[PDB]
């Protein structure tokens, strides 16, 4: 069986009720990234930033937020491939886990975890953060998580699939190139062509809820 590495971004959770970064501006939930997505922003106004992520963490756990068909198809893909499958997400949501995937690598961290900044230890956390703990979230200028295991998987992959990610943020946006260097077949699945879509050998566009189960089904049937 082929070794398959899947990278996901915010687009796979859009249809689950988690709104995406509007490209038109530089704003996330009507906030500038510099203010809520950098270490500097956290230092200048810790209580705004803590409130911002407290809000994201609560919204994540609302009843109307659930895995969609795309999350489910990736759980089925892992079921079929076992240890020849690796899922890497830029998302801080837990929808991959709720769908049934395991050993999900959250290269940009998790909303349901916080970090005691003196230690390096991440702690489970589902409620608000009050009065120093910080969100276990990778901000701009900080090193993504799990990169050693990710780059190893990139060099070993037979198929690399990028789903729901716009190709603006590195190093994740560079994964397709790395995969191609080590011979992987590359696939982009997205609502619209990404900033790096030209690097991919194969591509399908449309809502993830439709495009991803369609591709996964075609992949699984090609196995047997």
């Amino acid at each position: 069986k082929p070794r398959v590495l899947v990278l996901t971004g915010a687009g796979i959770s859009a249809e689950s009720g988690i709104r995406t970064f509007r490209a038109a501006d530089g704003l996330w939930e009507e906030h500038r990234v510099e203010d809520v997505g950098t270490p500097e922003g956290f230092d200048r106004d810790p209580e705004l930033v803590q409130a911002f992520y407290n809000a994201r963490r609560r919204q994540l756990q609302q009843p109307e937020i659930q895995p969609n068909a795309a999350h489910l198809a990736l759980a089925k893909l892992q079921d079929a491939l076992g240890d020849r499958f690796l899922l890497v997400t830029q998302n801080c949501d837990n929808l991959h886990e709720r769908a049934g995937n395991t050993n999900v690598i959250h290269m940009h961290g998790e909303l349901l975890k916080v970090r005691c900044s003196q230690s390096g230890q991440a702690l489970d956390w589902t409620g608000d953060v009050t009065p120093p703990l910080r969100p276990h979230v990778v901000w701009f200028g900080e090193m993504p998580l799990g990169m050693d295991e990710i780059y190893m998987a990139l060099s070993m992959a037979d198929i690399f699939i990028a789903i729901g990610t716009s190709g603006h943020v590195y190093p994740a946006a560079g994964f397709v190139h790395e995969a191609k260097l080590h011979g992987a077949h590359t696939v982009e699945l997205n609502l619209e062509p990404s900033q790096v879509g030209n690097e991919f050998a194969e591509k399908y566009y449309g809502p993830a809820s439709q495009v991803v189960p369609e591709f996964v089904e075609k992949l699984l049937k090609g196995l047997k």
Partner: peptide, 9 residues
Amino acid sequence: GGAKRHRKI
């Protein structure tokens, strides 16, 4: 690799 970074500086 490198740190998390956006395509525009």
